[PDB]
Ligand binder design. Structure first.
Ligand SMILES: S=C(NCCc1ccccn1)N[C@@H]1C[C@@H]2CC[C@H]1C2
Length: 209
């Protein structure tokens, strides 16, 4: 059973801008998603200091990068705090409204797309390289859910029936046909070394066989 929602008007305009603007420095999408993963790992690690039982769903705090050339997908996995159903539908888009609005004003004040993380909406930079983004997430306080959008103004949320994650978030990027360079190992390594050398959690690049 699937539910379809409309994006916030501001969010929908940001995604249409991100998709339709000719912007060449697309590699910043990885820094933003890794930075989001780092924040999610910070939150569960902090909460576990006063409640060690929050880690019963998994003690490992790490980020995995998993390219897949046959499926043309790049997947970013973290074992952070994860997201509830309310996060996916209401709360996170509500926090992001002021940031989205401010980000689009700045885009005419001279600022460029690479400053998206300074407004707390770096996640949507995934649509620089992805035609479709699937998010699998599991919070200690909710069930496992699957969020998905190909932009166009709508997204879906459903209960996920697949392999249980335990805890964390899996961002699955269905890459555009001309963006397969981000499925290459030395390209991913160069981007991580350039943008995310100072992340306080292990970032493991899964090499294909
Ligand atoms: S509101 C949003 N990103 C911005 C919030 C944020 C800021 C800093 C770190 C982490 N998260 N993303 C939401 C999560 C699912 C994917 C799209 C929607 C549903």
């Amino acid at each position: 059973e699937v539910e379809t929602f409309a994006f916030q008007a501001e969010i929908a305009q940001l995604m249409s801008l991100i998709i339709n603007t000719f912007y060449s420095n697309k590699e910043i999408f990885l820094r933003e998603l890794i930075s989001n993963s780092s924040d999610a790992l910070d939150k569960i690690r902090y909460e576990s200091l006063t409640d060690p039982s929050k880690l019963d769903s998994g003690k490992e705090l790490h980020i995995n990068l998993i390219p897949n050339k046959q499926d043309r997908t790049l997947t970013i996995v973290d074992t952070g705090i994860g997201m509830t159903k309310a996060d996916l539908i209401n709360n996170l888009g509500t926090i992001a409204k002021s940031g989205t609005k401010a980000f689009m004003e700045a885009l005419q004040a001279g600022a460029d797309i690479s400053m998206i993380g300074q407004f707390g909406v770096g996640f949507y930079s995934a649509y620089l390289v992805a035609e479709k983004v699937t998010v699998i997430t599991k919070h200690n306080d909710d069930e496992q859910y699957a969020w998905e959008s190909s932009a166009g103004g709508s997204f879906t949320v459903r209960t996920d029936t697949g392999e249980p994650m335990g805890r964390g978030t899996k961002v699955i990027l269905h890459l555009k046909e001309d963006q397969t360079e981000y499925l290459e190992e030395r390209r991913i390594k160069e981007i991580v070394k350039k943008h995310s050398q100072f992340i306080g959690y292990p970032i493991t690049l899964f090499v294909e066989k």
